[PDB]
Amino acid sequence: GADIVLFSGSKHVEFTDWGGTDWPSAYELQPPYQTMPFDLNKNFEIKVDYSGADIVLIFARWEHGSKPQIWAQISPYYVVDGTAVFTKEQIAKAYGSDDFSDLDYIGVKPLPSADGMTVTKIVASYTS
């Protein structure tokens, strides 16, 4: 029923400690530069099947002129089983608005772990 698959497979990210402020990702989009696989203006949820580490979703805007950098680092709205769910309403509250006209970056990233994080699926779906 109209799920969009952003990724399916077995993507492994090693990240054992904070060390630098270099921070590897499982998945990234840059909306100003890449055609988009889903429409940010719909009411959407992003669901990630993962294991091995705790997970976050980043929505970011780089600093430009007198508008500051936004780094909306979001924990899952909830986890069930092996799946993290993130919702548009949650993302918009962390981003400061639901206006994504200036969104530079979307990233799915692990927190530090000994074994690394593996993502097997990322799905966008549109909700009521």
Ligand X SMILES: OC[C@H]1O[C@@H](O[C@H]2[C@H](O)[C@@H](O)[C@H](O[C@H]3[C@H](O)[C@@H](O)[C@H](O[C@H]4[C@H](O)[C@@H](O)[C@H](O)O[C@@H]4CO)O[C@@H]3CO)O[C@@H]2CO)[C@H](O)[C@@H](O)[C@@H]1O
Under the rule (CB under 6 A), what is the footprint of ligand X? Answer: 18, 21, 23, 62-63, 69, 71, 73
The Cα 97–Cα 88 span in angstroms is: 10
The Cα 24–Cα 21 span in angstroms is: 10
Question: Token match 């497979």: residue?
Answer: 9
Backbone φ and ψ for 13, nearest 5 degrees, come out as -120, 120
Cβ 53 to ligand X shortest distance, Å: 13
Instruction: For residue 29, give the H/E element and its range.
Output: strand 27-29
Cβ 102 to ligand X shortest distance, Å: 13
The Cα 83–Cα 81 span in angstroms is: 6
| Nearer residue to ligand X within complex by CB, 41 or 69 | 69
| Nearer residue to ligand X within complex by CB, 32 or 82 | 32
| Nearer residue to ligand X within complex by CB, 71 or 78 | 71
| Nearer residue to ligand X within complex by CB, 21 or 66 | 21
Cβ 86 to ligand X shortest distance, Å: 16
Cβ 1 to ligand X shortest distance, Å: 35
